[PDB]
Amino acid sequence: DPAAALEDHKTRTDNRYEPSLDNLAQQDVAAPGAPEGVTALSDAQYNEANKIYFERCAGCHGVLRKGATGKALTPDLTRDLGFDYLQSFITYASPAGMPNWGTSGELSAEQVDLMANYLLLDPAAPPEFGMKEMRESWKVHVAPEDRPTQQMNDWDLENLFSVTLRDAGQIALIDGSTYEIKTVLDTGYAVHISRLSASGRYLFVIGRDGKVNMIDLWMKEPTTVAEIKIGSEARSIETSKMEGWEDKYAIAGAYWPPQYVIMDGETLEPKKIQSTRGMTYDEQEYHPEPRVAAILASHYRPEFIVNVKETGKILLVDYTDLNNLKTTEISAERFLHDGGLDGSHRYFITAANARNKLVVIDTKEGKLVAIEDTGGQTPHPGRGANFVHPTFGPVWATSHMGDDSVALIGTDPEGHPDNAWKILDSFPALGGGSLFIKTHPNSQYLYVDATLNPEAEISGSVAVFDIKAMTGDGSDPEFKTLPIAEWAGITEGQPRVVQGEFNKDGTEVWFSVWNGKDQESALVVVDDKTLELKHVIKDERLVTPTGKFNVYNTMTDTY
Amino acid sequence: DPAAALEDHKTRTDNRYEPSLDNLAQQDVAAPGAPEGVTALSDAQYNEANKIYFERCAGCHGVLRKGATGKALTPDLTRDLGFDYLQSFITYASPAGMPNWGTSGELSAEQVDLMANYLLLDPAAPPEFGMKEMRESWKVHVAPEDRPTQQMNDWDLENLFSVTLRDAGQIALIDGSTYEIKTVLDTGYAVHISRLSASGRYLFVIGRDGKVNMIDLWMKEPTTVAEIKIGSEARSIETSKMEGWEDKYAIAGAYWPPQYVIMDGETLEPKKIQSTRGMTYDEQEYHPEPRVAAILASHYRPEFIVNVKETGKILLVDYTDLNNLKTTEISAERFLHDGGLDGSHRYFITAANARNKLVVIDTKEGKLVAIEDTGGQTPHPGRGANFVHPTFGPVWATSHMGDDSVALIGTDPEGHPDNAWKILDSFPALGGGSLFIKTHPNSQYLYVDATLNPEAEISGSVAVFDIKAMTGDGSDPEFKTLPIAEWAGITEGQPRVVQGEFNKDGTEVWFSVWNGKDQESALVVVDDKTLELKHVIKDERLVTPTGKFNVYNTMTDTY
Numbered sequence A, B: 001d002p003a004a005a006l007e008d009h010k011t012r013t014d015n016r017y018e019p020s021l022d023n024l025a026q027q028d029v030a031a032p033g034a035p036e037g038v039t040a041l042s043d044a045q046y047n048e049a050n051k052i053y054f055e056r057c058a059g060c061h062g063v064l065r066k067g068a069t070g071k072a073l074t075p076d077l078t079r080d081l082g083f084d085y086l087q088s089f090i091t092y093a094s095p096a097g098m099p100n101w102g103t104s105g106e107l108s109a110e111q112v113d114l115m116a117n118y119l120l121l122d123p124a125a126p127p128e129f130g131m132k133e134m135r136e137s138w139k140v141h142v143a144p145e146d147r148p149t150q151q152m153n154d155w156d157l158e159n160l161f162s163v164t165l166r167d168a169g170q171i172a173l174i175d176g177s178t179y180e181i182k183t184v185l186d187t188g189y190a191v192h193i194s195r196l197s198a199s200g201r202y203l204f205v206i207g208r209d210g211k212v213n214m215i216d217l218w219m220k221e222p223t224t225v226a227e228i229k230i231g232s233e234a235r236s237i238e239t240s241k242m243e244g245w246e247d248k249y250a251i252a253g254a255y256w257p258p259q260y261v262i263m264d265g266e267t268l269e270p271k272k273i274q275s276t277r278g279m280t281y282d283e284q285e286y287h288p289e290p291r292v293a294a295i296l297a298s299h300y301r302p303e304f305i306v307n308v309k310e311t312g313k314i315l316l317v318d319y320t321d322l323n324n325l326k327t328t329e330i331s332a333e334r335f336l337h338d339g340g341l342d343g344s345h346r347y348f349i350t351a352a353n354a355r356n357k358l359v360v361i362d363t364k365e366g367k368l369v370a371i372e373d374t375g376g377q378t379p380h381p382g383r384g385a386n387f388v389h390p391t392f393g394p395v396w397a398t399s400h401m402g403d404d405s406v407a408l409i410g411t412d413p414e415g416h417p418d419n420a421w422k423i424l425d426s427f428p429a430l431g432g433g434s435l436f437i438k439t440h441p442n443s444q445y446l447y448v449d450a451t452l453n454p455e456a457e458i459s460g461s462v463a464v465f466d467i468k469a470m471t472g473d474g475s476d477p478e479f480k481t482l483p484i485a486e487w488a489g490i491t492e493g494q495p496r497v498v499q500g501e502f503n504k505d506g507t508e509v510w511f512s513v514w515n516g517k518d519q520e521s522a523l524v525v526v527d528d529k530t531l532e533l534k535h536v537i538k539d540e541r542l543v544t545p546t547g548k549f550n551v552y553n554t555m556t557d558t559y
């Protein structure tokens, strides 16, 4: 019955991180005709419903409605359910998106009817975006030959932090030692992440709208030297990290169209576009919308590591020959999202989040090694946290969006075979809604945020575990609670703390105190040795600060 | 100007070999709604138009109407053209399909309107066909354990011929020395080709409807031991031919859905389904319907060689690990169709027919090594003809559907370097409309048919060149004309001669004298040494005989 929506369509701490295709939602669409027994929506009504669908529903159900974390909603199925059921079900609204920009999920009576009617109609597929379109958008502002041959500014590049100023479609380059904002660059679109070339010279940013900008950090005044659009919705980018392939390539991953694109690392020239449409690994059924999630770069082979979400495939893409393209399509687990390499940089550990599993790939051998349930609900590691547990040896950790647990997996087949690829411990942190866990080789602490927790005090704090004191005896390791938001001294709203990121020396860890566009935000720097406040960064230009990426730690994959 | 149809839609000798999706056409489809400004068709009208479209137009324009050899006909494009233009253009008739069973390409006034209206409507994609559907159709009639452990009949299996009795969906197993039809087996729909397992024990047939049957030639009475459906439209199948992998796998290629499927070589259990939807190699644009054409098997690596037509990709699929799937996606040339391995079985030479090119792949290194224009119009080699030319060295030959030329390409990069992958000679045979060229290591003759030629005298005859008499002087080699149809003694609507195939010893070559379903056909056996008529195979059961495959020559790729 429609009342089932109370368990499926309400907001959880772990169902707020699904795609909001708000850039694609801006495209106008033609209203389809309606077959017998179905009523057509006008052009305005259809577009209104389509916008809501793309912004709020497509993340879980797909723009093509073939299903993702939520079931398929194709016309054959919806027509059988009927308008009445749909209307009653949709009245409850849908899960809220991310705080500080996402939807509340609430719908008016008029919107409810629009959505019910929209679901009964046949949807068209949004436009593709291929080479012609990419080349049209491709602009090389400063040709390689016109760029410096050595660093021309006096900045400490490796200790620089590239910070997303989300809603303003800008990034701030901040000195990691003095905390001075060296520059604020416009990208004209919300940047999702910053990635660095292996040499650390080139800064790449990917906008949610599919726009890629590459910045030359050696310039007297660093700016975008090249840009290109690779799709309509994208969230991932990475650079080549195999020795000998430094600065050779960059790769971007898109949600729509479902594809990844390999670009020249110096000019962004689009070299190879690969569709991710394909078969699910387990039921082996065609899926028309397998989104690219995290993309990492192998340190063992000249390959990119691409997570394809809906089909549960991890692709190892060899970039040594883009014409005779070698790839290894690894059957893993559905709903692959993020992950990171272990301390040795040999194994890729990734969260198939909706299924509570960690998938482990051996990047040297190019094969699946393990799939283990974390015991928690919806793991979201970011790139995770590698450390040497006093008892267990090398481990990689992840926290969860669905509960307060932190899980550790052994990552040393050679030295600790009995612990390898096994969940060794699970213990509580602040609460549910965590997004990022962090540590550094020079730190004895493990930091865990709780960004999406519904309690302001919790979402504004961070749990810190003392790795040195961990025994792994089965008890719950104690943690210190750092009042990060409180330290920032922000009066308005309930700012959420998100994502720890260390400086190059691994002596200070930064957190974003994230408030909405029309509210006050800040960055808080914590002295890692003492766990005391080091500095609070505030500036009128620091609007909606979210992701932060230290140049050195990003270029070297140190986490 | 709709009058352009006189040229665009004119029947030619080289545009009759495009897909007719007559099995898929059998599916009944519901009429879509018509958007504002468009008139709707009833379910009956739409279904009628859909059938015609799939049978006569989809081959060139695509079932999704995104274009193949003919341009896209999507609603956005057709609505701009308007009903009047479409109606007028389509009135001129479309290209005829293949002789005997293909369409005439003529429509009634009522049908013309149905088609024009159909083109203005939004088409739905035909159903997918995944693992669940394949497993539901999977039937193992005789489990491996219950099959013979040695040959239980007295047949000379290696000299046996598996002949397609087209329209009736049967195959005739015919003795290569006595010419006796040993048995006629039913599979349902028209079998397109017969392929043999590497051991020569299992005979695999693929029906145009996607039905695969595997027959155990060791049975006292050979019959199907397993069957499975792998799609709705399919034309290709092959077996594993890497030493050590005999009888391990079989692979089938489909037109719809666009995918290939690897099956267990002993039971047909479906193991891995791969979608071929993807990007075109050159302008890198997404194509939603890249059909699988020829599929060969590597003798150098445990891989299948898959031609993907519309995108111009040749896939080398490693079957040693189906979970961590390694493939090489080779950018080649669009419109890949058929081809064969050179005499050394190392290089795959294939025709990108619409572009008059021969693409050469090194199966050992897994890379493209050449793309050469044949100088002729629309090459169609079948598997081609390999021979050691007296002056040029090893060469592979192809004839053409669009003209009377025979082209020779050097196939010896190590031994005849300058001649390698270059068109060394081109000369005329009987006339245009050729489909197959053939030779055998034990023969000094090169046979060339002219099946689609408009002249009965030509379509019912074969050209024969004496390889020993070939010089490298650039002149045109003479040929003897064998009156194959005349030798058969059949007076019906100009039966067409097609496809030479040799017996095991290469001492006799067979040709099909292909007439319609309600007409008389025959197989003509020619004595290779004397080039004289040896025997004519006639039987009331021998209806629409087309493809012939000798067990030995097929299992060993001897051509």
Ligand code: DHE
Binding pocket: A016, A017, A018, A019, A020, A021, A098, A164, A166, A191, A192, A193, A208, A235, A236, A237, A238, A292, A293, A294, A295, A337, A338, A382, A383, A498, A499, A546, A547, A548
């Ligand atoms: C696929 C993906 C990655 C992996 C990138 C990679 O490794 O190359 C990623 C990583 C990230 C990372 C990576 C951190 C790291 O250390 O690697 C961060 C900081 C981040 C901050 C946010 N993300 Fe993210 N994010 C999505 C997708 C993704 N986010 C979404 O689909 C979602 C849920 C909604 C949307 O439509 O964008 C979403 C919302 C957010 C936010 O609201 C965050 C908190 C703030 C913001 O700026 O948008 N995402």
Ligand code: DHE
Binding pocket: B016, B017, B018, B019, B020, B021, B098, B164, B166, B191, B192, B193, B208, B235, B236, B237, B238, B292, B293, B294, B295, B337, B338, B382, B383, B498, B499, B546, B547, B548
């Ligand atoms: C993809 C493909 C192959 C390669 C198979 C492989 O390598 O495994 C092939 C091969 C073939 C071969 C392979 C010969 C060989 O020696 O390998 C033959 C005999 C053949 C006889 C015909 N083919 Fe064929 N053929 C098609 C497709 C193909 N044909 C079509 O799409 C088309 C044009 C129309 C259709 O809808 O089927 C078509 C019509 C025909 C015919 O009308 C022929 C002459 C008679 C028949 O039985 O249908 N096709």
Ligand code: HEC
Binding pocket: A008, A009, A015, A016, A018, A052, A053, A056, A057, A058, A059, A060, A061, A069, A070, A071, A072, A073, A081, A086, A089, A090, A093, A094, A095, A115
């Ligand atoms: C992910 C966080 C979701 C969002 C956002 C939306 N939906 Fe959803 N929906 C989701 C789930 C988990 C389920 C239950 C079934 C399952 O997949 O486990 C649903 C179900 C529906 C239904 C009912 C379908 C049926 O009973 O067959 C409808 C009609 C539906 N969802 C509509 C819908 C719309 C219009 C949304 C945007 C306003 C939307 N959903 C968002 C998960 C998620």
Ligand code: HEC
Binding pocket: B008, B009, B015, B016, B018, B053, B056, B057, B058, B059, B060, B061, B069, B070, B071, B073, B081, B086, B089, B090, B094, B095, B115
């Ligand atoms: C391949 C042998 C074809 C068959 C069979 C059919 N069509 Fe075709 N069509 C083909 C070509 C080569 C062209 C010219 C344009 C090009 O791609 O080079 C066309 C053109 C059309 C058009 C005109 C479209 C325009 O924009 O002007 C229409 C409306 C069309 N074809 C319709 C159509 C239908 C309905 C067919 C089956 C009855 C059909 N075509 C078959 C090639 C081929």
